[PDB]
Tab-separated table of C-alpha atoms in Angstrom:
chain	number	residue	atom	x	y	z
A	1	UNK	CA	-7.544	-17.536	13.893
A	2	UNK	CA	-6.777	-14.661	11.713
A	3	UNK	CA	-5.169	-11.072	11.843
A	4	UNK	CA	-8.175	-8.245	13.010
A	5	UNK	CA	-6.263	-6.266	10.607
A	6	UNK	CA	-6.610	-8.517	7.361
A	7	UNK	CA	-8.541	-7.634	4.356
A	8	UNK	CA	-8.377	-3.947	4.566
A	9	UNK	CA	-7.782	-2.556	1.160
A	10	UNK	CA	-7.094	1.437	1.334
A	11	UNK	CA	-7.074	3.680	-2.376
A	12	UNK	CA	-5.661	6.849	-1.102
A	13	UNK	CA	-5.972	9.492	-4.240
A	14	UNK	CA	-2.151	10.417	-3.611
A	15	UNK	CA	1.275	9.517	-1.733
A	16	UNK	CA	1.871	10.355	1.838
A	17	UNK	CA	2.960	13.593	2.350
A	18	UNK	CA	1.660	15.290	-1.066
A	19	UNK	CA	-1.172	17.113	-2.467
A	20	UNK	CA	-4.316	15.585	-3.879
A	21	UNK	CA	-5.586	17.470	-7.430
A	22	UNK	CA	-9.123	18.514	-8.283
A	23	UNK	CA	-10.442	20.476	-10.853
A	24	UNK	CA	-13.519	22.526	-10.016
A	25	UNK	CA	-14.953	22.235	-13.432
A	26	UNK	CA	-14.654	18.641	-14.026
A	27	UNK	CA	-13.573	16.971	-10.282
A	28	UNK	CA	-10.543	15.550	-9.000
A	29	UNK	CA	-8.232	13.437	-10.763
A	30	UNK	CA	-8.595	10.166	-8.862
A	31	UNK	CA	-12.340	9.947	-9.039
A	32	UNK	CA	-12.045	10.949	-12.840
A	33	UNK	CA	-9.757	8.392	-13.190
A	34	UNK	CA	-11.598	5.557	-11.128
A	35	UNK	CA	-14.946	6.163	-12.801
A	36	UNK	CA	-13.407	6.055	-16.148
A	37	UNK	CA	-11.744	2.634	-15.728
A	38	UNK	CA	-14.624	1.360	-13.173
A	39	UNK	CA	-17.208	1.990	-16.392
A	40	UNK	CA	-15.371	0.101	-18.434
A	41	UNK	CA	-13.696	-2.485	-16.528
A	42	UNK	CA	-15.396	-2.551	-13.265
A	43	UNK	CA	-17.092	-5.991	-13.820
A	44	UNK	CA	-14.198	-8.071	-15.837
A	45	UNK	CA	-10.626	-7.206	-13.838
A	46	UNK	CA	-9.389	-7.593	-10.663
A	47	UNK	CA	-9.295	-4.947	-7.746
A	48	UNK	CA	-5.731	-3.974	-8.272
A	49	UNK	CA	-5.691	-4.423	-12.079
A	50	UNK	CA	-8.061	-1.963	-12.003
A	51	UNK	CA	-6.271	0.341	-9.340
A	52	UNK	CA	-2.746	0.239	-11.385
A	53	UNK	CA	-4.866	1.519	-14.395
A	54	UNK	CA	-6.075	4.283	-12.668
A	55	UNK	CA	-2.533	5.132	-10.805
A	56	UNK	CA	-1.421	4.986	-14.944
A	57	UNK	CA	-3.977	7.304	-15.917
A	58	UNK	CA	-3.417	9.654	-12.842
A	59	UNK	CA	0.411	9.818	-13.796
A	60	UNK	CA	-0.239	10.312	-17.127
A	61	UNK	CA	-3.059	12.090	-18.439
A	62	UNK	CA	-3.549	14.911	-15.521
A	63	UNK	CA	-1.042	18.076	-14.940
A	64	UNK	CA	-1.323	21.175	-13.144
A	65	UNK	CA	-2.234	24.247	-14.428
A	66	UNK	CA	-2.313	27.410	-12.054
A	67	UNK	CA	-1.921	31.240	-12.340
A	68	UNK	CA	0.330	30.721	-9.387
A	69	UNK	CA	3.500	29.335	-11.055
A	70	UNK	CA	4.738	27.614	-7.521
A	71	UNK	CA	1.717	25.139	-8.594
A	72	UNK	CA	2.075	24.872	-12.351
A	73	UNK	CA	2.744	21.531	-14.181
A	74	UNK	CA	2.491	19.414	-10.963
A	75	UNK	CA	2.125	16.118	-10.926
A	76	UNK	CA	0.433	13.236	-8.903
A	77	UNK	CA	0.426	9.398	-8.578
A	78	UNK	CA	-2.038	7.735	-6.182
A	79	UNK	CA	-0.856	5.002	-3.352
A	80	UNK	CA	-2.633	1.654	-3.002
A	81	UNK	CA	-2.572	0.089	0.204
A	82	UNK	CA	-3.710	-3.656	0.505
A	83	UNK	CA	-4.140	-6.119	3.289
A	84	UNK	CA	-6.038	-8.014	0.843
A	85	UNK	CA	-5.510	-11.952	1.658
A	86	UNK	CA	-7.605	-13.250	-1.517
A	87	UNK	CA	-7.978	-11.547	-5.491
A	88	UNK	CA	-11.071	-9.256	-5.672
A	89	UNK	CA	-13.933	-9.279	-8.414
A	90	UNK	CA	-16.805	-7.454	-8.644
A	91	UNK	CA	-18.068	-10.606	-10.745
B	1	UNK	CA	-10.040	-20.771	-3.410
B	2	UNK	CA	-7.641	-17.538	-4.959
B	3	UNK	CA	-10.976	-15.236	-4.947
B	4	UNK	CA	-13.183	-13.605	-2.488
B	5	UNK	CA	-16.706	-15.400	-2.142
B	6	UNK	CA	-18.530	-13.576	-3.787
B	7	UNK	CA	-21.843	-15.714	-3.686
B	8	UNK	CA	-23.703	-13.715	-1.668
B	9	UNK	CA	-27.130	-11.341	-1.276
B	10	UNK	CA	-26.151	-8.557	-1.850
B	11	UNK	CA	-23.064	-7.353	-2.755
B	12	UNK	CA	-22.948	-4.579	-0.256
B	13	UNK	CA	-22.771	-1.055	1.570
B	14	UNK	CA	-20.735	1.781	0.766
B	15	UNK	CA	-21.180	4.756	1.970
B	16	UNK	CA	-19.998	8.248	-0.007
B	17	UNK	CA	-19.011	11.115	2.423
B	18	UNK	CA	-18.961	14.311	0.383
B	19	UNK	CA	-17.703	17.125	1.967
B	20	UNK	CA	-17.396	20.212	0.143
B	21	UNK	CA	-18.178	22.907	2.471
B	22	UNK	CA	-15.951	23.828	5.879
B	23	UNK	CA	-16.413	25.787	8.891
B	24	UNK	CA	-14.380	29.503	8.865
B	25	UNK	CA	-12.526	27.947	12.316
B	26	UNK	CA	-10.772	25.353	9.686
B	27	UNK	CA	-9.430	27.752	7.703
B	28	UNK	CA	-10.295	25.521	4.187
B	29	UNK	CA	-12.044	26.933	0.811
B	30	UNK	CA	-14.630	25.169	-1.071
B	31	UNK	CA	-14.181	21.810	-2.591
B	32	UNK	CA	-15.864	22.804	-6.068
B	33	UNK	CA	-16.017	19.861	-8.153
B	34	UNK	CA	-16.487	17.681	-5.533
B	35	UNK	CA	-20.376	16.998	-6.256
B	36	UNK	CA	-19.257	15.942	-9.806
B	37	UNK	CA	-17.299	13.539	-8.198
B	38	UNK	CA	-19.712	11.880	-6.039
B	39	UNK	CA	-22.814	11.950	-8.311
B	40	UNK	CA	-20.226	9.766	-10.873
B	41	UNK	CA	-18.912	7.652	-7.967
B	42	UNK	CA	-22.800	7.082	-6.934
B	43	UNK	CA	-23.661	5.685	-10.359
B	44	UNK	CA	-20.319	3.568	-10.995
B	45	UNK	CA	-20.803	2.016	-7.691
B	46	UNK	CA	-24.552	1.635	-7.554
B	47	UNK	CA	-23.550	-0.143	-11.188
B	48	UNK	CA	-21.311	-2.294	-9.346
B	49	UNK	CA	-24.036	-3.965	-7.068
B	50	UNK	CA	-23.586	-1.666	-4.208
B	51	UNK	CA	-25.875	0.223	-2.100
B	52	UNK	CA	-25.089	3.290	-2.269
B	53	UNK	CA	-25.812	6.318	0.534
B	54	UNK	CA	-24.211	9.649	0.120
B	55	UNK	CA	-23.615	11.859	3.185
B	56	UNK	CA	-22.732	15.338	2.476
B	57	UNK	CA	-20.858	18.087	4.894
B	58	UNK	CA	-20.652	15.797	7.745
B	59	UNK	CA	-18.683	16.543	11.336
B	60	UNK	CA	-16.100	14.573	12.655
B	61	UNK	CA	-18.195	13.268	15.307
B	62	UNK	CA	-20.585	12.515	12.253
B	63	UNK	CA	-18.301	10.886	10.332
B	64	UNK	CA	-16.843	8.612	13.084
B	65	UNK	CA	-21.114	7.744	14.126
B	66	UNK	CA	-21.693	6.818	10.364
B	67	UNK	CA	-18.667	4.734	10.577
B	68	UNK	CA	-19.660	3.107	13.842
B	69	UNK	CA	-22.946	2.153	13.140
B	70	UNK	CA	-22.063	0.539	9.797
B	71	UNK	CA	-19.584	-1.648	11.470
B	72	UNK	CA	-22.669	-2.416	14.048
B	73	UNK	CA	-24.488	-3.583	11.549
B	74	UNK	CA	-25.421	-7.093	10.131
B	75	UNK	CA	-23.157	-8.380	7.148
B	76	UNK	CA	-23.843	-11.946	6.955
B	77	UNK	CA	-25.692	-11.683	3.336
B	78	UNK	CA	-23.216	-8.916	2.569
B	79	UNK	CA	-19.361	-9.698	0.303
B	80	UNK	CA	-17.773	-6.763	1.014
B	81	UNK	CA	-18.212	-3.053	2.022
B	82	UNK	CA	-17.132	0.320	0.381
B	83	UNK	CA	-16.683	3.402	1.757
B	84	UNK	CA	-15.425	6.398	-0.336
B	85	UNK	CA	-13.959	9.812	1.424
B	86	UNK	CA	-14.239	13.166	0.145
B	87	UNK	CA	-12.688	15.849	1.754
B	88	UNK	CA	-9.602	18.106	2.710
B	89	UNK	CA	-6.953	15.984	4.062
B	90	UNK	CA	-3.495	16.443	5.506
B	91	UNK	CA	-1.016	13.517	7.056
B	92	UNK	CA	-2.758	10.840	8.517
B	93	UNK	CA	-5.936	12.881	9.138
B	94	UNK	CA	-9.554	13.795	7.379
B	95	UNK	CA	-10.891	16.684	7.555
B	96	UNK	CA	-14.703	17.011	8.905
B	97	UNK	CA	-16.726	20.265	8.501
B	98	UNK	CA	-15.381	21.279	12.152
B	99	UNK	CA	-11.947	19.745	12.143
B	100	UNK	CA	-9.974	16.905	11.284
B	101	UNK	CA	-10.042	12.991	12.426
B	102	UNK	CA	-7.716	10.653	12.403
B	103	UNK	CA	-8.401	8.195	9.009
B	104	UNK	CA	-6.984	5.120	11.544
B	105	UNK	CA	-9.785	5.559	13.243
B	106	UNK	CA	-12.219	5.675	11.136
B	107	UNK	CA	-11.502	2.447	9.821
B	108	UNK	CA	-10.769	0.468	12.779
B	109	UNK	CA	-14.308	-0.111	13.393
B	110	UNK	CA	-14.381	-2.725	11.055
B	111	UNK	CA	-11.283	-4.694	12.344
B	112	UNK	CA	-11.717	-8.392	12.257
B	113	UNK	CA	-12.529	-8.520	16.646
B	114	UNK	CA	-14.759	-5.455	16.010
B	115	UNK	CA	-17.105	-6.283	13.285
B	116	UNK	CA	-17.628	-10.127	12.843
B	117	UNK	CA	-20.084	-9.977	9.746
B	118	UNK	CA	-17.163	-8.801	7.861
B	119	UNK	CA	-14.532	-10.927	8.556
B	120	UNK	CA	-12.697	-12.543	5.730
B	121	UNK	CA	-15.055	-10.157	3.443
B	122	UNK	CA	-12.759	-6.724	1.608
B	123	UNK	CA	-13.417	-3.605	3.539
B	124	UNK	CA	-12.368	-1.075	0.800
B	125	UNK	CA	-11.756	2.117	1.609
B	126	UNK	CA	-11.651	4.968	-1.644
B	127	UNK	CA	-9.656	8.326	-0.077
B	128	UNK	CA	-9.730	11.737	-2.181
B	129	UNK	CA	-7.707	13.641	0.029
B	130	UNK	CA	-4.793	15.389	0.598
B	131	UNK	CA	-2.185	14.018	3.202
B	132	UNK	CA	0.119	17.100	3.271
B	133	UNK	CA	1.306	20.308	1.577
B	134	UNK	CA	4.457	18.965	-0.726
B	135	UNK	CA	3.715	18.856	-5.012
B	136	UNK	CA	5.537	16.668	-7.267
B	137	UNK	CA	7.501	18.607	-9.951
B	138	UNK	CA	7.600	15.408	-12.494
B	139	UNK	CA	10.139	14.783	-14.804
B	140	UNK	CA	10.090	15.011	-18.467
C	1	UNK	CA	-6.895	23.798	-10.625
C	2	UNK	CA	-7.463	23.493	-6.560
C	3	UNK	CA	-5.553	21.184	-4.125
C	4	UNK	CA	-7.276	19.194	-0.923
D	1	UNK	CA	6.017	14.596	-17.669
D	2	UNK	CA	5.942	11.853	-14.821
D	3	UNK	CA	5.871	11.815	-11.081
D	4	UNK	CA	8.616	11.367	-9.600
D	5	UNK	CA	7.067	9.323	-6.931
D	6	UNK	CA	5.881	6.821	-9.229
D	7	UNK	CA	6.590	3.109	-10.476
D	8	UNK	CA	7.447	2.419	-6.562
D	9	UNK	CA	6.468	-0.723	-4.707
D	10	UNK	CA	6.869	-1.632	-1.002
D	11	UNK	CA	6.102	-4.754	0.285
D	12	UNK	CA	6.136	-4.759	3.882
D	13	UNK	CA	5.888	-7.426	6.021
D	14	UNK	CA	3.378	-6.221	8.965
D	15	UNK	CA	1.194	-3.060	8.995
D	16	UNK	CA	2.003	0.189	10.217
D	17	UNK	CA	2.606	0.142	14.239
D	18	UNK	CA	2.728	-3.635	14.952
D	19	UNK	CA	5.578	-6.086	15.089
D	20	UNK	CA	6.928	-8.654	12.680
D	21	UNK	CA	7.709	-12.356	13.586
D	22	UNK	CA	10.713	-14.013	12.769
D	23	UNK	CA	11.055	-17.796	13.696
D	24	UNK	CA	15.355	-18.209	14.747
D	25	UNK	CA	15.392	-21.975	12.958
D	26	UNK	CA	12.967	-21.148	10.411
D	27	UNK	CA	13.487	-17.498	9.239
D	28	UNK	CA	11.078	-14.967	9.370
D	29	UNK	CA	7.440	-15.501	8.662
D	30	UNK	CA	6.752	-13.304	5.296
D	31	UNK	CA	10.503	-14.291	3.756
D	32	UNK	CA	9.333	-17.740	4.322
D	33	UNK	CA	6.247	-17.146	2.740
D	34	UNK	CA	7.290	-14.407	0.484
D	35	UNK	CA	10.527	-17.726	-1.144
D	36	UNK	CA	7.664	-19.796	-1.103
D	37	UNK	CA	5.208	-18.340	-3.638
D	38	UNK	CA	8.128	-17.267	-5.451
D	39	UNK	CA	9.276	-20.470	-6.068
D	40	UNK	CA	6.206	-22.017	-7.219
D	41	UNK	CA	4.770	-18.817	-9.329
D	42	UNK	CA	7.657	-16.184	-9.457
D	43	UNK	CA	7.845	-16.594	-13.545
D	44	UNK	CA	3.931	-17.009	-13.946
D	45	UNK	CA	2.150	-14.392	-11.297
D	46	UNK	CA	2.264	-10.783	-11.595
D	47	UNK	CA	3.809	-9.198	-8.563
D	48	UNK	CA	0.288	-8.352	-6.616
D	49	UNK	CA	-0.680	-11.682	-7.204
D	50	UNK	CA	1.885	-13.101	-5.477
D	51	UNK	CA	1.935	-10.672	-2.541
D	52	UNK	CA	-1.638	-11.369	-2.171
D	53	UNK	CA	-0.901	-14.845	-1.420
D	54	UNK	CA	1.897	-14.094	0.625
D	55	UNK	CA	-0.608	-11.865	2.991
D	56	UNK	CA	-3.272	-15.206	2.825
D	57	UNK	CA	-0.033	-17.712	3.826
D	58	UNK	CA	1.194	-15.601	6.688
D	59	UNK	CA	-2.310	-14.200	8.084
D	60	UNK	CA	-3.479	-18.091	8.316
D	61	UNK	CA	-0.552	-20.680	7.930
D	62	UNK	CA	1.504	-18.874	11.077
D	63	UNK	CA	0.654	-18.317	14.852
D	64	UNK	CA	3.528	-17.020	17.482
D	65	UNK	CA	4.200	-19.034	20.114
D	66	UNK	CA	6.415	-17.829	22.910
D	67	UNK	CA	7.085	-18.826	26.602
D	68	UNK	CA	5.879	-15.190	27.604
D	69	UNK	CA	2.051	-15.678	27.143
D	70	UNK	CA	1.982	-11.845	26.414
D	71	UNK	CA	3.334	-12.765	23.202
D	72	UNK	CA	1.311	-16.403	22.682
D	73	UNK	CA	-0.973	-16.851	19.584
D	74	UNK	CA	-0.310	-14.024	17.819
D	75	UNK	CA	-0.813	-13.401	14.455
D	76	UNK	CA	0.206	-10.778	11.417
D	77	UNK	CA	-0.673	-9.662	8.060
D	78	UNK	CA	1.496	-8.117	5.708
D	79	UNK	CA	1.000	-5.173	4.031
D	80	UNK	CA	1.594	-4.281	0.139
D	81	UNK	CA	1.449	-0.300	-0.908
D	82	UNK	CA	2.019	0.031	-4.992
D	83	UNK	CA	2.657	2.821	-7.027
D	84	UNK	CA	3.025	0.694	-10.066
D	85	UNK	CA	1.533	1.918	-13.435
D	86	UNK	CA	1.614	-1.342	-14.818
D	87	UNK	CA	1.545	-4.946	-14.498
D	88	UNK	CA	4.391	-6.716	-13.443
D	89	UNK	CA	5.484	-9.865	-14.588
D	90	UNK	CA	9.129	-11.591	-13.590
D	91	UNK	CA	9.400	-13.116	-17.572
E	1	UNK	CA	0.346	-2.343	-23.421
E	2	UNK	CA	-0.468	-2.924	-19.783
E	3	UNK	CA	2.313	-4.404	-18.526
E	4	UNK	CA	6.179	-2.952	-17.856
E	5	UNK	CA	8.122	-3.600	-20.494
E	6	UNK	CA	10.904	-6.539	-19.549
E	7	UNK	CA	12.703	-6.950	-22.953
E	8	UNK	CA	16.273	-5.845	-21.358
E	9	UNK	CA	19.464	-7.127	-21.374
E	10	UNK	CA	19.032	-7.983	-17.504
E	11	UNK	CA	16.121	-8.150	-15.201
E	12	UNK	CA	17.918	-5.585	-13.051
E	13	UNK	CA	20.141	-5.291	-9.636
E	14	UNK	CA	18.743	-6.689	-6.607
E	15	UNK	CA	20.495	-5.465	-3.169
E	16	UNK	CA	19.852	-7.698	-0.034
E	17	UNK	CA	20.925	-5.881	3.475
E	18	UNK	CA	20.961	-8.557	5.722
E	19	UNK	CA	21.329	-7.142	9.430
E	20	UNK	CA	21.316	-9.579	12.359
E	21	UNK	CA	24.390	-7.805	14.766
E	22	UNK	CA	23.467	-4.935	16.449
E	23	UNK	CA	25.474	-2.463	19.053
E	24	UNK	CA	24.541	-3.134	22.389
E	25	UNK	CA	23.470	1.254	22.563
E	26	UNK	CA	20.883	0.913	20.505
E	27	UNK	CA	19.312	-1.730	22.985
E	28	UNK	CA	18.370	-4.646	20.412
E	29	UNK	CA	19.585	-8.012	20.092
E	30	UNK	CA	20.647	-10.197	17.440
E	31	UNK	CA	17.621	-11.640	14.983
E	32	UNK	CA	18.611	-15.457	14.722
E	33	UNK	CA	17.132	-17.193	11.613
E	34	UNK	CA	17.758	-13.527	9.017
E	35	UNK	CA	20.446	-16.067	7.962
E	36	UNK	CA	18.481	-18.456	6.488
E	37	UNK	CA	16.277	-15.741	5.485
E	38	UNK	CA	18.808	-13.981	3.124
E	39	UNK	CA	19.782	-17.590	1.875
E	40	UNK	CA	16.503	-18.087	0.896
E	41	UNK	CA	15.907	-14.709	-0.786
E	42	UNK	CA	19.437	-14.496	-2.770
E	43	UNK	CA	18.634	-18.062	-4.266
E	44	UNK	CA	15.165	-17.092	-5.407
E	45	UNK	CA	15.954	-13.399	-6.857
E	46	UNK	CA	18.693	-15.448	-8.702
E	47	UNK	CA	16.476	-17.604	-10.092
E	48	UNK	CA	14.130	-14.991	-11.272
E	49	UNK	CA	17.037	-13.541	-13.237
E	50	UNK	CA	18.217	-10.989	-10.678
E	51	UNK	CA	21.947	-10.183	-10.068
E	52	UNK	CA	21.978	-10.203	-6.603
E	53	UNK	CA	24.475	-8.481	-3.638
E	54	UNK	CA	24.032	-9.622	-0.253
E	55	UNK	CA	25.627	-7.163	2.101
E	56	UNK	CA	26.127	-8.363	5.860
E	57	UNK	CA	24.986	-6.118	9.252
E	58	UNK	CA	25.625	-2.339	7.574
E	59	UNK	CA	25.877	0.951	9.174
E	60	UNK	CA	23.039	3.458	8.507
E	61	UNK	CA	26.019	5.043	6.843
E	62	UNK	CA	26.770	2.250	4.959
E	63	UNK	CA	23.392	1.241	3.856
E	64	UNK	CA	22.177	5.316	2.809
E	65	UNK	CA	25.769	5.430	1.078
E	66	UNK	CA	24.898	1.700	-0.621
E	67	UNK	CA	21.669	2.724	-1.888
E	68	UNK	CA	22.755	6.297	-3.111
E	69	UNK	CA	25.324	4.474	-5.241
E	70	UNK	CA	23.614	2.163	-6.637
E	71	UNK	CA	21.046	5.032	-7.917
E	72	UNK	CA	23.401	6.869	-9.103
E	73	UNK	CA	24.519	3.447	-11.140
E	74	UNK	CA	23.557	3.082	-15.017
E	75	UNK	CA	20.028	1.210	-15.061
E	76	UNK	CA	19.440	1.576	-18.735
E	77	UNK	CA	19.547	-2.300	-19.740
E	78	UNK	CA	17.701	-3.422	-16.003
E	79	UNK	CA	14.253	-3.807	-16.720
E	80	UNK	CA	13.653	-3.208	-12.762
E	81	UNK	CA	15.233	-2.572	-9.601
E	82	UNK	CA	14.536	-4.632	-5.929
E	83	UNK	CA	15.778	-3.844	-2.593
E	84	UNK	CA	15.411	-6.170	0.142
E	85	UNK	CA	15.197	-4.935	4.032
E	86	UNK	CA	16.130	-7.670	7.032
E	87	UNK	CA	16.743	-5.575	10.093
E	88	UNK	CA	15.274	-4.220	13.482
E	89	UNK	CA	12.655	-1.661	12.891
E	90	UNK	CA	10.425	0.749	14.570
E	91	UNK	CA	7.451	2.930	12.780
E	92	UNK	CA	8.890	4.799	9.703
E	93	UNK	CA	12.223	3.697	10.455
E	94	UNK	CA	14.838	0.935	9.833
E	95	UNK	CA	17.747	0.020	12.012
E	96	UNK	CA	21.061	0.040	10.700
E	97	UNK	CA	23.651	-1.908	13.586
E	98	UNK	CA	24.537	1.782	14.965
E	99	UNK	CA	20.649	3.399	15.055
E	100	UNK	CA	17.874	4.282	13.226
E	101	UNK	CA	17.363	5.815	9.657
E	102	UNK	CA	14.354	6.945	8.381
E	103	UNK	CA	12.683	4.308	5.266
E	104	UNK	CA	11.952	7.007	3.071
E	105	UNK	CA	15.373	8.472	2.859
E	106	UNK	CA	16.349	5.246	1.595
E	107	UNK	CA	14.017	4.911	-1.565
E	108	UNK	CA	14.098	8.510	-2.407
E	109	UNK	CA	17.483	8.155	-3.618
E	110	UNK	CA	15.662	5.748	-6.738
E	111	UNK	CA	12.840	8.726	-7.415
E	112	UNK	CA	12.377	9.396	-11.208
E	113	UNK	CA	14.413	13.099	-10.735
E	114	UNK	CA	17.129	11.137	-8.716
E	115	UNK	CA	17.748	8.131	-10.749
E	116	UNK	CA	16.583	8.910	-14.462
E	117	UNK	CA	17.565	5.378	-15.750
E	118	UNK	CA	14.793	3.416	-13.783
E	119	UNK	CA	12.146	6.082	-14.919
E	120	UNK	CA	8.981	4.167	-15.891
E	121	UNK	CA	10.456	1.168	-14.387
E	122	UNK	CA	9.635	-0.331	-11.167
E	123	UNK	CA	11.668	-0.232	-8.012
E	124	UNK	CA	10.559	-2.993	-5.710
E	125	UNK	CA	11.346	-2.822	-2.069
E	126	UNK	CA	10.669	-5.634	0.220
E	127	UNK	CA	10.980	-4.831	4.316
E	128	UNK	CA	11.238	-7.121	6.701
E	129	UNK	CA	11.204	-5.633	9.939
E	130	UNK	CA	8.889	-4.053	12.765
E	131	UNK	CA	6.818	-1.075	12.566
E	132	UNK	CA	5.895	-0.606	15.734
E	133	UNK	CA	5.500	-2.508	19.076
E	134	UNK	CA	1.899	-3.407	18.837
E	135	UNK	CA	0.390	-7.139	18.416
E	136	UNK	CA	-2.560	-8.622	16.531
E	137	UNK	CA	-4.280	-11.168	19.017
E	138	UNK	CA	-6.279	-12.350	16.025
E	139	UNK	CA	-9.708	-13.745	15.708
E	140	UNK	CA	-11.034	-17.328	14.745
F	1	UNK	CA	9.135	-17.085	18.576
F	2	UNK	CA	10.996	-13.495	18.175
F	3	UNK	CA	9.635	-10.190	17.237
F	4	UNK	CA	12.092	-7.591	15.010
């Protein structure tokens, strides 16, 4: 037998209790990220390699900026959550 | 024996749910850039191996259907399956055009007692959302 | 830039 | 500029909402599991490596058994969430 | 380039709370076996390089007042930082032997504006404990 | 078999 909730792998774009970032011009952060690393690496590293890549590229490439100054120069990391029981390639 | 089998048909589903556009009763803007995002996320998955379906605008009583009937479907020849959210978000909760939905229970459908062509097989799950209202001031 |  | 929620990892040892079994002459199931790996890989896997075989050692090598059959065969999977920008190796 | 950076003078701190007494008001009973647990876990941190503290049934006093302390501790030759969690717990929450505090109160104190000498460098926390009352019957 |  094995857990019903096993092998559930969840890539939320940010932490629990905090806002996800999107730019209208160019999309959101995460999915900028993702699709960056996913062309490049998609086919050659593993699920969470890639994932850590992107949560790098989230924290360090993207920052807020806003008229509003309550929203300028924010910030954002994304959250992996994984149930994952083996290591994942799309390979 | 430290990988997911991977020798199968087809490497899978995954659907896209793009929702840019909300009912006035929500009381949430437009998601402008969002259609960027799934036209990229189309091509970098359908580059993966996956087949790719992209619903846009959907309710919550949509979203949970779309949900349900891909877990009622038959995975044998199937490794994995994909599904990729796009929409306003607080704590614990998607947003449809009409409301919001718990995310818990839009995954559930594929636990391992509720969708047997998927056991031992990766159900991913890709989230753009937000799950609340704080920001994160950095640090230099 | 927007938030969800 | 970096978030301040980043470079976090939580290893948990059940999902959200369910319990976690803990065997009174053996220890609890993921610590068990969790020394186990570690002892083996700790200086050779990177850390999601090693969870990941952590969740495949205590979704399939443990089953509950209790007297109350409303707590007989049950089973649990562990559950990783990383903000990690990097890979992380013990060496 | 992609991986933390471990040339320190010391792999880090790693703080065990070990909890297997409780007080009879908050109606749970004593986990048999956490000994050997935190036996097991101080002799493997140890060997990974770790300078390990093993602190015995704590307050929720004690273990926010631990935690804030060792934050507020000088991190600049640790290369990381690990936490390990054996109590009673319920969703969100761990049990100290007098009640419940909430798990996120206890890692915020190591956030990169709280504790500026583990910035960039990762704070492991492993949690033993419940989340919840429900059980997973499983599948074959 | 005990649950935490």
């Amino acid at each position: 037998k094995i857990p019903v909730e096993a092998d559930f792998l969840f890539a939320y774009s940010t932490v629990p209790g905090y806002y996800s970032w999107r730019s209208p011009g160019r999309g959101s952060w995460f999915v900028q990220a993702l699709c960056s690393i996913l062309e490049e690496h998609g086919k050659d590293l593993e699920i969470m390699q890639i994932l850590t890549r992107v949560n790098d590229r989230v924290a360090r490439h993207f920052e807020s900026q806003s008229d509003d100054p309550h929203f300028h120069e924010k910030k954002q990391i994304p959250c992996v959550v994984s149930m994952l029981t083996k290591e994942l390639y799309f390979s | 024996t430290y990988q997911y089998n991977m020798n199968f048909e087809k490497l899978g589903k995954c659907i896209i749910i793009n929702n840019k556009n909300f009912d006035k009763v929500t009381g949430m803007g437009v998601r402008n850039g969002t259609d960027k995002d799934a036209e990229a996320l189309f091509k970098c998955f359908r580059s993966l191996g996956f087949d790719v379906i992209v619903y846009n605008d959907c309710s919550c009583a949509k979203m949970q259907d779309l949900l349900k009937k891909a877990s009622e479907e038959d995975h044998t020849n199937a490794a994995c399956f994909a599904c990729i959210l796009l929409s306003h978000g607080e704590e614990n909760v998607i947003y449809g055009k009409d409301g919001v939905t718990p995310i818990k229970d839009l995954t559930a459908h594929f636990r391992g007692d509720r969708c047997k062509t998927l056991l031992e097989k990766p159900k991913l799950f890709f989230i753009q959302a937000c799950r609340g209202t704080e920001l994160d001031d950095g640090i230099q | 830039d927007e938030v969800x």
